[PDB]
Amino acid sequence: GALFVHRDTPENNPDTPFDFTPENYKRIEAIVKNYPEGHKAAAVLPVLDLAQRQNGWLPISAMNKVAEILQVPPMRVYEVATFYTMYNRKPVGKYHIQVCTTTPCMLRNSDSILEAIQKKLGIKVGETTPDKLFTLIEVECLGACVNAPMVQINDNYYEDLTPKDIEEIIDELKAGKIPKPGPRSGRFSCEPAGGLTSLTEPPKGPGFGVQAGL
Amino acid sequence: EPFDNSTYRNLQHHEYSTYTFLDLNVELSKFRMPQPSSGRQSPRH
Amino acid sequence: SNLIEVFVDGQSVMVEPGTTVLQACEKVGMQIPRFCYHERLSVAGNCRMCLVEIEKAPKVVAACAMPVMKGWNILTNSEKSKKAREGVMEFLLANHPLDCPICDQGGECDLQDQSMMFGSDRSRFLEGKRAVEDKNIGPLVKTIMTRCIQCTRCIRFASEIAGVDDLGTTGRGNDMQVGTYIEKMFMSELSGNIIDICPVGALTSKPYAFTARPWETRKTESIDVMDAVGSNIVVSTRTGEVMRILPRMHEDINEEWISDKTR
Amino acid sequence: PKKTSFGSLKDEDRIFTNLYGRHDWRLKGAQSRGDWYKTKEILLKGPDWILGEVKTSGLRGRGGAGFPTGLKWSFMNKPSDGRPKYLVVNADEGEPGTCKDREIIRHDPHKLVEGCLVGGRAMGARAAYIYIRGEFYNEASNLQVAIREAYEAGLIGKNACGSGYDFDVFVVRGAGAYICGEETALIESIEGKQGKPRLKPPFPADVGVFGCPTTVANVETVAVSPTICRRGGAWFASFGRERNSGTKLFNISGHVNHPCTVEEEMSVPLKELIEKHAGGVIGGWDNLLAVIPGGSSTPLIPKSVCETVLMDFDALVQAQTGLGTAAVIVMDRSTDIVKAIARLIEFYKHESCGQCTPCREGVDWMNKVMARFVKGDARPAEIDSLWEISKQIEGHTICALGDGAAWPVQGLIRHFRPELEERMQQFALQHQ
Numbered sequence A: 001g002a003l004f005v006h007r008d009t010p011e012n013n014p015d016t017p018f019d020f021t022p023e024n025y026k027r028i029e030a031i032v033k034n035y036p037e038g039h040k041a042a043a044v045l046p047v048l049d050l051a052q053r054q055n056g057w058l059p060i061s062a063m064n065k066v067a068e069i070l071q072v073p074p075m076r077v078y079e080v081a082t083f084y085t086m087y088n089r090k091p092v093g094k095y096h097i098q099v100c101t102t103t104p105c106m107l108r109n110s111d112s113i114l115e116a117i118q119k120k121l122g123i124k125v126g127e128t129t130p131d132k133l134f135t136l137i138e139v140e141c142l143g144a145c146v147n148a149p150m151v152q153i154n155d156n157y158y159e160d161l162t163p164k165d166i167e168e169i170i171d172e173l174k175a176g177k178i179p180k181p182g183p184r185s186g187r188f189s190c191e192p193a194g195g196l197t198s199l200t201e202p203p204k205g206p207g208f209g210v211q212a213g214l
Numbered sequence B: 001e002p003f004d005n006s007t008y009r010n011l012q013h014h015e016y017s018t019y020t021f022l023d024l025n026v027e028l029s030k031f032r033m034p035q036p037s038s039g040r041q042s043p044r045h
Numbered sequence C: 001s002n003l004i005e006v007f008v009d010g011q012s013v014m015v016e017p018g019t020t021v022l023q024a025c026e027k028v029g030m031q032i033p034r035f036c037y038h039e040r041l042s043v044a045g046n047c048r049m050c051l052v053e054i055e056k057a058p059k060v061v062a063a064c065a066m067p068v069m070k071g072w073n074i075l076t077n078s079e080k081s082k083k084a085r086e087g088v089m090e091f092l093l094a095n096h097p098l099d100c101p102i103c104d105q106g107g108e109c110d111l112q113d114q115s116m117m118f119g120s121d122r123s124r125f126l127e128g129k130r131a132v133e134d135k136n137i138g139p140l141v142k143t144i145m146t147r148c149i150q151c152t153r154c155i156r157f158a159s160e161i162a163g164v165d166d167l168g169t170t171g172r173g174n175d176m177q178v179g180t181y182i183e184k185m186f187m188s189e190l191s192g193n194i195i196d197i198c199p200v201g202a203l204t205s206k207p208y209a210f211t212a213r214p215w216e217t218r219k220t221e222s223i224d225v226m227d228a229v230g231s232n233i234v235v236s237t238r239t240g241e242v243m244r245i246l247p248r249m250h251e252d253i254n255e256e257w258i259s260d261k262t263r
Numbered sequence D: 001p002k003k004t005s006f007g008s009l010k011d012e013d014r015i016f017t018n019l020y021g022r023h024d025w026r027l028k029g030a031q032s033r034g035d036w037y038k039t040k041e042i043l044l045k046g047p048d049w050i051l052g053e054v055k056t057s058g059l060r061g062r063g064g065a066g067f068p069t070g071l072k073w074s075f076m077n078k079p080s081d082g083r084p085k086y087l088v089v090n091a092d093e094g095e096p097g098t099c100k101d102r103e104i105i106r107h108d109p110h111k112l113v114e115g116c117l118v119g120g121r122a123m124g125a126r127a128a129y130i131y132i133r134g135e136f137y138n139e140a141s142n143l144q145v146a147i148r149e150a151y152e153a154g155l156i157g158k159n160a161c162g163s164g165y166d167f168d169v170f171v172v173r174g175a176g177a178y179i180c181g182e183e184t185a186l187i188e189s190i191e192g193k194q195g196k197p198r199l200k201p202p203f204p205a206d207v208g209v210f211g212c213p214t215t216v217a218n219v220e221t222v223a224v225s226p227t228i229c230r231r232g233g234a235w236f237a238s239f240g241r242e243r244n245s246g247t248k249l250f251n252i253s254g255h256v257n258h259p260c261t262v263e264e265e266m267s268v269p270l271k272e273l274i275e276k277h278a279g280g281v282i283g284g285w286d287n288l289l290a291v292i293p294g295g296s297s298t299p300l301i302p303k304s305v306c307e308t309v310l311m312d313f314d315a316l317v318q319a320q321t322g323l324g325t326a327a328v329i330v331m332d333r334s335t336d337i338v339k340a341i342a343r344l345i346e347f348y349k350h351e352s353c354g355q356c357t358p359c360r361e362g363v364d365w366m367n368k369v370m371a372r373f374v375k376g377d378a379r380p381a382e383i384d385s386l387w388e389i390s391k392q393i394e395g396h397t398i399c400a401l402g403d404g405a406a407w408p409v410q411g412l413i414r415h416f417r418p419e420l421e422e423r424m425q426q427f428a429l430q431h432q
């Protein structure tokens, strides 16, 4: 899947109604002013992401609108849209489960969590739910491998899961309520499961051993 | 006063809207400086 | 003046500072095999066939984009250079589809010639190859994108020479595909020249499509008359019949390009 | 004289005082710890002074580079040609096992922004382009409310800390790619183009983002800078060993009891590290079958070498591997090392940007042939072919992703050839 060739569809066509709210245009101005003038196409990453933030799935009309907003040729927008991850070019459910399966994450039987996702939703890897809520796909090492096999939905990490812990969060999102983004078994950020092997003392004080006239 | 060594206070990240990035980026825009000019407004000009 | 002395596999030459390594080698006569660098186009260092060994240097460097420095005997025929060329081409020539009898580039494929000169004589690819669906981009250019090597020459020609920035790349990894994403219509006045910049038969001439294997057609120099520019061209005629018109190098009239109307 | 052993770093000597989120990550807790202390004097002391102490401390590349920070930052001491000098900080952390940058940035962002301010003052840089991996949304949101608080306090911005140096910070998202961790691919990504690395030279020094002179850095690399600047290079030079000195935020995961990420002094043998902090490998030290050091790019090491080798770049080089980013991942006996490396190189194939031929083609070729190996469909000759292909990938790629994907294959072959042989013999026997 994930075909990098767009085709004219009634849902995704140049006609497709896409635009930005006035607040979205204010955000785009903020993105533009961050970068030096003359090189403004460099801001093509957030604004198009901003489109996601208001639409999720990005129609070809969204790419064309971003191209005309940033005064950049349309395919220069298409390239960054089709070369980076996320940037969903096909409609997806509002919730978007992403379970890492890389080696450090897989070692603690991440496949158990994967099959638990599958059995809870009935859907398989890829396809979204028939009710258009969740999207069962896998991701690479997103940067939370130090915890137990963990998943990210939209913009919420959950760490230190277990084939059991995912069930509650899944039917929480299915029920509408949001689970708390964080590890599911102690270990607030990354501390040892047994306890605190370090950082167990009050912190350093300002002025600790400096050379005074440094 | 007693420093609790087993608590987490990075909790405000839980209640973050989908626009939170740009929501305070727009406010931060005020505390900035003029960007340097490359001359031509576009590399295509 | 500022001419810096640079050796190439021995004998030394006078080289303008800022000159790439491959130009320095060309100053003597030996030529780096290449697929990504065109003399009148921007460099990208993409094919990695431009790799060569620098004397007393650990890793090979790309002769396409390498500002040559003091001394720097260019070991063109070093064993490490030959091994690097062999490996880079083995990688290039893995997913290449078995179309040489059916591809119009046959006999003047460049890739075939480099394989004859600097390449292996057997394939150890034990797995299945990759296939890319064709993207039509005109009645003027035949498109078989499974044969492409992603040398990015077409994209750079579209951006700088023609100026119509619609020919690009999509995706990543081995599934990266160079095309137009949208079924767009590349109809610039210089589009036909992409037929002559594509090293492989990924882009060919539709009107001439498989009319003659180019090892038969005699080549006769002449001048285009469709325009007052008078671009130098070569008529490829076999058996008393005109097959196609190719651009001739002049550097004062047409560089090495002609209009689609002329072609 | 020479420190006989290394380990059990002093708790007050740990740079990341809030690594576990035990302190206020905003301005108040940061200043309580000692962040933003003596900044004014630090800017007044000058780029030459800051570069002197960064050499004295002697930081090898904390972001899995190894190049000393001294000359790398001295590359931005030449007089300004007029182009706007910039500082860039990399925070991709897509590397299997990399979790330290995310933790520090969601827990100690003020130290990071203070590293950017002090470093950029040393660099002659107009402002900082702090690029955050797009998956870390809340982490970026936290760092930028911290940045806004600093701007309100006047520490960063015009006349930074009352010094006249007009440094600034720009929070940059990234639509997700491990190749974006590469410095030139990072330049390309932040330039709005694809995340394809550019060939050097032009080095990132003279030609960087938008053609302006820039210089990349790791989150940890610049984050440790302000503390060592306030304390002096003696603090960092004391811990660890020669060349490889100071401290590194080690990450531990895999088959360990407590897969945690902890700060510890530099050049420590693994034997202490996994057992004392991670509660030991599940099943005891005997159960430990292999350990990959910092980053999956570095080849895996059998247990016969890990227990003795220290965690320092030179020693891991002697151990036929690299130190990387201290992402120690441990695999026990029950782990199928072949399938683990299979998933790892599958990740590498998924992350290849496809620019240069060697990466784009050879990594996919490796994926297919080595998946066949994992299943067992192969002849004993193909091991040598895989080794030669790994050599072909190495050194011929524009960026170092090719090397980082070739090395795990080399380590797997070298350390577990007989396991491969018996796997394929069983595959030959099962089918008749």
Ligand SMILES: Cc1cc2nc3c(=O)[nH]c(=O)nc-3n(C[C@H](O)[C@H](O)[C@H](O)COP(=O)(O)O)c2cc1C
Residues within 6 Å of the ligand: D060, D061, D062, D063, D064, D065, D066, D067, D090, D091, D092, D093, D094, D095, D178, D179, D180, D181, D182, D183, D184, D216, D217, D218, D219, D221, D399, D400, D401, D404
């Ligand atoms: C494929 C690839 C991925 C990389 N990813 C990262 C990364 O996530 N973080 C990082 O700090 N450096 C990364 N690097 C290294 C950078 O290219 C650069 O050398 C490094 O950021 C310098 O860090 P330092 O300033 O601490 O020495 C990566 C390199 C490659 C080739």
Ligand code: SF4
Residues within 6 Å of the ligand: C096, C097, C098, C099, C100, C101, C103, C104, C105, C106, C107, C109, C111, C112, C147, C199, C200, C201, C202
């Ligand atoms: S372009 Fe491809 S199919 Fe055609 S001759 Fe060359 S290698 Fe063979």
Ligand code: SF4
Residues within 6 Å of the ligand: C147, C148, C149, C150, C151, C152, C153, C154, C155, C178, C197, C198, C199, C200, C202, C203
């Ligand atoms: S289509 Fe032809 S010119 Fe374009 S990248 Fe592929 S081989 Fe090169």
Ligand code: SF4
Residues within 6 Å of the ligand: D179, D196, D197, D351, D352, D353, D354, D355, D356, D357, D358, D359, D360, D397, D398, D399, D400, D401, D402
């Ligand atoms: S090794 Fe080459 S093809 Fe692979 S990501 Fe790096 S530059 Fe791109």
Ligand code: FES
Residues within 6 Å of the ligand: A100, A101, A102, A103, A104, A105, A106, A140, A141, A142, A143, A144, A145, A146, A150, D095, D096, D097, D098
């Ligand atoms: S392994 Fe799952 S995030 Fe790194």
Ligand code: FES
Residues within 6 Å of the ligand: C034, C035, C036, C037, C044, C045, C046, C047, C048, C049, C050, C051, C062, C063, C064, C065
């Ligand atoms: S010339 Fe070296 S890759 Fe194109």
Ligand SMILES: [K+]
Residues within 6 Å of the ligand: C105, C194, C195, C196, C197, C198, C199, C200, C201, C202, C203, C204
């Ligand atoms: K051709």
